[PDB]
PDB file of C-alpha atoms in Angstrom:
ATOM      1  CA  UNK C   1     129.923  76.717 102.519  1.00 41.92           C
ATOM      2  CA  UNK C   2     126.494  77.626 103.705  1.00 40.53           C
ATOM      3  CA  UNK C   3     126.854  81.767 102.405  1.00 40.64           C
ATOM      4  CA  UNK C   4     128.057  79.899  99.356  1.00 42.01           C
ATOM      5  CA  UNK C   5     124.637  77.743  99.132  1.00 43.53           C
ATOM      6  CA  UNK C   6     122.298  80.316 100.348  1.00 41.47           C
ATOM      7  CA  UNK C   7     123.861  82.860  97.202  1.00 43.09           C
ATOM      8  CA  UNK C   8     123.992  80.464  94.675  1.00 44.88           C
ATOM      9  CA  UNK C   9     120.095  79.038  95.677  1.00 44.89           C
ATOM     10  CA  UNK C  10     119.348  82.396  95.547  1.00 42.33           C
ATOM     11  CA  UNK C  11     120.965  82.715  91.881  1.00 41.40           C
ATOM     12  CA  UNK C  12     119.011  78.594  90.791  1.00 45.00           C
ATOM     13  CA  UNK C  13     116.575  80.073  92.357  1.00 47.76           C
ATOM     14  CA  UNK C  14     115.920  83.213  89.497  1.00 47.38           C
ATOM     15  CA  UNK C  15     117.210  80.866  87.191  1.00 47.95           C
ATOM     16  CA  UNK C  16     113.793  78.225  88.369  1.00 45.13           C
ATOM     17  CA  UNK C  17     111.456  81.299  87.638  1.00 43.45           C
ATOM     18  CA  UNK C  18     112.303  82.541  84.878  1.00 42.77           C
ATOM     19  CA  UNK C  19     112.329  79.003  82.951  1.00 41.81           C
ATOM     20  CA  UNK C  20     108.585  78.377  84.321  1.00 44.73           C
ATOM     21  CA  UNK C  21     107.805  81.977  82.694  1.00 46.97           C
ATOM     22  CA  UNK C  22     109.065  80.682  80.119  1.00 48.32           C
ATOM     23  CA  UNK C  23     106.911  77.614  79.607  1.00 50.64           C
ATOM     24  CA  UNK C  24     104.315  79.420  81.206  1.00 50.37           C
ATOM     25  CA  UNK C  25     103.761  82.083  78.084  1.00 47.83           C
ATOM     26  CA  UNK C  26     104.624  78.251  75.833  1.00 47.01           C
ATOM     27  CA  UNK C  27     101.482  77.902  76.808  1.00 46.01           C
ATOM     28  CA  UNK C  28     100.212  80.864  76.521  1.00 47.43           C
ATOM     29  CA  UNK C  29     100.650  81.294  72.839  1.00 45.76           C
ATOM     30  CA  UNK C  30      99.757  77.888  71.846  1.00 43.97           C
ATOM     31  CA  UNK C  31      96.609  78.312  73.866  1.00 40.28           C
ATOM     32  CA  UNK C  32      95.353  81.554  71.990  1.00 40.43           C
ATOM     33  CA  UNK C  33      96.229  79.637  68.817  1.00 37.46           C
ATOM     34  CA  UNK C  34      93.426  86.312  63.104  1.00 40.49           C
ATOM     35  CA  UNK C  35      96.467  88.734  62.695  1.00 41.49           C
ATOM     36  CA  UNK C  36      96.188  90.636  65.587  1.00 41.35           C
ATOM     37  CA  UNK C  37      96.177  86.586  67.674  1.00 40.71           C
ATOM     38  CA  UNK C  38      99.047  86.404  65.176  1.00 36.59           C
ATOM     39  CA  UNK C  39     100.775  89.262  66.104  1.00 36.43           C
ATOM     40  CA  UNK C  40     101.002  88.369  69.691  1.00 34.91           C
ATOM     41  CA  UNK C  41     101.807  85.056  69.910  1.00 39.41           C
ATOM     42  CA  UNK C  42     104.896  86.358  67.214  1.00 40.03           C
ATOM     43  CA  UNK C  43     105.798  89.277  70.017  1.00 39.20           C
ATOM     44  CA  UNK C  44     105.529  86.825  73.378  1.00 38.45           C
ATOM     45  CA  UNK C  45     108.161  83.708  71.318  1.00 38.14           C
ATOM     46  CA  UNK C  46     109.995  86.884  70.598  1.00 39.81           C
ATOM     47  CA  UNK C  47     109.746  87.421  74.516  1.00 39.74           C
ATOM     48  CA  UNK C  48     109.729  84.380  75.750  1.00 40.76           C
ATOM     49  CA  UNK C  49     113.470  84.349  73.357  1.00 41.27           C
ATOM     50  CA  UNK C  50     114.985  87.214  75.241  1.00 42.20           C
ATOM     51  CA  UNK C  51     114.491  86.507  78.709  1.00 42.00           C
ATOM     52  CA  UNK C  52     115.651  82.567  77.656  1.00 41.75           C
ATOM     53  CA  UNK C  53     119.136  84.238  76.304  1.00 42.40           C
ATOM     54  CA  UNK C  54     119.411  87.349  78.920  1.00 41.85           C
ATOM     55  CA  UNK C  55     118.915  84.376  81.901  1.00 42.27           C
ATOM     56  CA  UNK C  56     122.292  82.188  80.237  1.00 42.55           C
ATOM     57  CA  UNK C  57     125.123  84.392  81.852  1.00 41.92           C
ATOM     58  CA  UNK C  58     123.189  82.899  85.322  1.00 42.80           C
ATOM     59  CA  UNK C  59     124.799  79.850  83.763  1.00 43.86           C
TER      60      UNK C  59
ATOM     61  CA  UNK G   1      84.092  81.231  76.745  1.00 42.06           C
ATOM     62  CA  UNK G   2      85.669  77.848  76.648  1.00 40.45           C
ATOM     63  CA  UNK G   3      88.601  79.920  74.870  1.00 38.33           C
ATOM     64  CA  UNK G   4      88.501  84.179  77.696  1.00 36.12           C
ATOM     65  CA  UNK G   5      88.493  81.444  80.475  1.00 35.94           C
ATOM     66  CA  UNK G   6      91.870  79.962  79.717  1.00 34.22           C
ATOM     67  CA  UNK G   7      93.369  82.737  78.013  1.00 35.03           C
ATOM     68  CA  UNK G   8      92.596  83.881  81.306  1.00 33.48           C
ATOM     69  CA  UNK G   9      94.389  81.638  83.728  1.00 34.26           C
ATOM     70  CA  UNK G  10      96.974  81.837  81.898  1.00 33.67           C
ATOM     71  CA  UNK G  11      97.936  85.441  81.161  1.00 30.55           C
ATOM     72  CA  UNK G  12      96.580  84.838  85.773  1.00 30.16           C
ATOM     73  CA  UNK G  13     100.208  82.282  85.626  1.00 29.73           C
ATOM     74  CA  UNK G  14     101.301  84.778  83.932  1.00 29.12           C
ATOM     75  CA  UNK G  15     101.013  87.815  86.454  1.00 25.96           C
ATOM     76  CA  UNK G  16     102.135  84.945  88.991  1.00 24.51           C
ATOM     77  CA  UNK G  17     105.095  83.676  87.504  1.00 24.11           C
ATOM     78  CA  UNK G  18     106.220  87.275  86.980  1.00 22.21           C
ATOM     79  CA  UNK G  19     105.766  88.188  90.366  1.00 22.14           C
ATOM     80  CA  UNK G  20     107.934  85.285  91.756  1.00 22.81           C
ATOM     81  CA  UNK G  21     110.325  86.024  89.371  1.00 23.93           C
ATOM     82  CA  UNK G  22     110.222  89.907  90.865  1.00 24.46           C
ATOM     83  CA  UNK G  23     110.932  88.781  94.542  1.00 20.96           C
ATOM     84  CA  UNK G  24     113.455  87.114  93.547  1.00 21.21           C
ATOM     85  CA  UNK G  25     115.730  89.101  91.357  1.00 15.85           C
ATOM     86  CA  UNK G  26     115.018  91.830  94.569  1.00 16.61           C
ATOM     87  CA  UNK G  27     116.754  88.393  96.096  1.00 16.63           C
ATOM     88  CA  UNK G  28     119.536  88.176  94.498  1.00 19.36           C
ATOM     89  CA  UNK G  29     120.155  91.832  94.072  1.00 21.08           C
ATOM     90  CA  UNK G  30     121.276  91.852  98.100  1.00 20.74           C
ATOM     91  CA  UNK G  31     123.410  88.791  97.886  1.00 22.02           C
ATOM     92  CA  UNK G  32     125.330  91.340  95.038  1.00 19.53           C
ATOM     93  CA  UNK G  33     125.342  94.009  97.119  1.00 22.13           C
ATOM     94  CA  UNK G  34     126.991  92.179  99.491  1.00 21.58           C
ATOM     95  CA  UNK G  35     129.195  89.188  98.113  1.00 22.28           C
ATOM     96  CA  UNK G  36     131.248  91.225  97.277  1.00 23.77           C
ATOM     97  CA  UNK G  37     132.491  93.285  94.096  1.00 24.64           C
ATOM     98  CA  UNK G  38     134.793  93.408  90.573  1.00 26.50           C
ATOM     99  CA  UNK G  39     134.237  92.145  87.759  1.00 26.49           C
ATOM    100  CA  UNK G  40     130.382  90.186  88.956  1.00 24.46           C
ATOM    101  CA  UNK G  41     128.567  92.587  90.169  1.00 22.83           C
ATOM    102  CA  UNK G  42     128.178  94.667  86.978  1.00 21.41           C
ATOM    103  CA  UNK G  43     128.175  91.521  85.392  1.00 21.25           C
ATOM    104  CA  UNK G  44     124.833  90.915  87.515  1.00 23.67           C
ATOM    105  CA  UNK G  45     124.182  94.838  86.753  1.00 19.54           C
ATOM    106  CA  UNK G  46     123.352  94.640  84.109  1.00 18.79           C
ATOM    107  CA  UNK G  47     122.035  91.347  83.701  1.00 18.90           C
ATOM    108  CA  UNK G  48     119.773  92.316  86.393  1.00 17.35           C
ATOM    109  CA  UNK G  49     118.732  95.562  83.591  1.00 18.74           C
ATOM    110  CA  UNK G  50     118.339  93.173  81.102  1.00 19.23           C
ATOM    111  CA  UNK G  51     116.284  90.794  83.324  1.00 14.42           C
ATOM    112  CA  UNK G  52     113.735  94.015  84.908  1.00 13.60           C
ATOM    113  CA  UNK G  53     113.686  95.228  80.845  1.00 13.91           C
ATOM    114  CA  UNK G  54     112.310  92.045  79.371  1.00 12.78           C
ATOM    115  CA  UNK G  55     109.095  90.778  82.709  1.00 12.83           C
ATOM    116  CA  UNK G  56     108.755  95.488  81.397  1.00 14.00           C
ATOM    117  CA  UNK G  57     108.240  93.755  77.759  1.00 14.39           C
ATOM    118  CA  UNK G  58     105.982  90.604  78.715  1.00 12.15           C
ATOM    119  CA  UNK G  59     103.898  92.650  81.210  1.00 14.15           C
ATOM    120  CA  UNK G  60     103.388  94.783  77.244  1.00 14.57           C
ATOM    121  CA  UNK G  61     102.859  91.622  75.692  1.00 16.00           C
ATOM    122  CA  UNK G  62     100.669  89.301  77.863  1.00 14.07           C
ATOM    123  CA  UNK G  63      98.668  92.675  79.811  1.00 12.54           C
ATOM    124  CA  UNK G  64      98.705  91.193  83.132  1.00 13.42           C
ATOM    125  CA  UNK G  65      99.623  94.049  85.188  1.00 13.61           C
TER     126      UNK G  65
END
């Protein structure tokens, strides 16, 4: 159980930090909101969507 | 200037978090090289490569380095 709890903790940490990154990018994009600002903001939304998706498999 | 400082500090927070993510992925990686084999390591190798590629994109777009 201790070692399984360690593996679980390492997966949960990755999941938690990925959700934090999603929020940091959201603040970045929200705060910055002309095409180039707009285009970076869409790119950030897309990067956020991606890492959210990829991280879903972590459960 | 308020807008510039706020953007710089937001990009800094992105840098910090992405550094922390990369460190956590390194640890998760040790455990996968040891916890067994089969479906889940190959599932993990898929997921890890995708995660690191998502991080590379974030760096390209946010430019945190």
